[model samples]
Target: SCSMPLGMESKAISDAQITASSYFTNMFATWSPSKARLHLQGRSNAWRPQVNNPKEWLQVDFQKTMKVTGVTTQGVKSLLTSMYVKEFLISSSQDGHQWTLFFQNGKVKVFQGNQDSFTPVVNSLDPPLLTRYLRIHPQSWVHQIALRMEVLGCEA
Candidate 1:
């Protein structure tokens, strides 16, 4: 097969519910788990942890079985700068308890500080995966643990 463009296929989040471990509360609601969805507005959209630790994570529940082929994650961007994820782990589960690693300790580049500082990182699973849930465990960050994410897949 080959890469499919954005509008050619639907996003996984359209069929799933997303959540996170923790989120930073600001006056303007800058960092919340819900902002990580593909439908969010603004270029500076993201989810940031209240505490910058590896235990913090973001997950998507498909409600039922679904096929996941890939994921795309971007950094927090704004007029000041950007904060990008340095390493993370992607896991999947059917029952939401026992999770299997699809991508482990994956690393991506940090943003080159400037306006329009969006650097998207894409990861695809070989042969694809059928699961009910997909979780991202962020291990490290160039500045802090933050994410703007998109799940790539369709129904099983």
Candidate 2:
């Protein structure tokens, strides 16, 4: 089947389904963790990390397993500065405990991230990650690590 947007854009995914390792929020707009979604259209803001590090991750619980084809990413710009990730690693988990890093030929695959704070980047999982939980771990960033993203897949 052709790739379908799982839920992010349409808000089909519940608020509890999308989460992050740590959040940078103001709560002015009630800064929330769930604001980290792809193409927010500037009506709302994106998600930022409380701590900028490789271990910090943006996670999603599909609530069920999915065909899980790919992922889309975009950078965010706060009033202070433009922030975006440059590279990242993808990990999958069924039980949310044991995890598998996306790899090919014994080397961990790194998905290329956004170049600027607007253009969205899509990375197709060569072999679809069919797990229930997908985590995005950023490797590099500019200014600071702030991002918005979407998962691409369909119900299993």
Candidate 3:
């Protein structure tokens, strides 16, 4: 599930310009205002186990809220529990905006002597706002829930 980046190109030779499983889309098709670390270049990933409560929430939908700033996640396996929240909800908006839910569960800024298996750096959750649409919901782990990007941010 991981490849594309030693010479990155595929996606059907760019499929008229990248647009599959878009990580939001950089170049939107092949250029870049951002996005395209390629979720660390795929290599197959998965997440499931939190169910029922609040109907078991697990979302990362930035479908339209644009002012995010910046975000990059790659936890890759973990599920402790205690109703998660390493970081989630860095919302914004103004005109086509109307969204608001700026920064939450921040200030943890973990490092923990290398354990989560690299790439779990958080430290944004600032006073930045102006939303479009942002929503990352994590709560409860133990059965294992650590894929990364529990949260990341920028947009000012």
Candidate No. with top lDDT: 2
Better of 1 and 3 by TM-score: 1
**Candidate 3 lDDT, 30-128, residue by residue in tens:** 222121222433332333222322223223333333233344444443223321224333333344235454434643222221134334443343444
Clashing residue pairs in candidate 1 are none
lDDT of 3: 0.31
Candidate numbers sorted by TM-score from highest down: 2, 1, 3
User: How are the candidates ranked when ordered by lDDT, highest leading?
Assistant: 2, 1, 3
Q: Is candidate 2 or candidate 3 better by TM-score?
A: 2
The residue pairs that clash in candidate 2, if any, are 27-30, 27-31
RMSD of each: 5.1, 1.7, 15.6
Which candidate number would show the highest TM-score if scored against the true structure? 2
lDDT of 2 by residue, 1-156 (tens): 748988887899878998888887554533255877888866346777788899988888888888888899998776757789999999989999898999977899988899999899999998888889999999999998877888997877
Per-candidate TM-scores read 0.76, 0.92, 0.23
Candidate 2 local Cα displacement, residue 77, angstroms: 1.5
Roughly what TM-score does model 2 have, to 2 decimal places? 0.92
lDDT of 1 by residue, 19-112 (tens): 7888887775567776775434574377888999978888888788877777777776555766767777777799999988764345432222
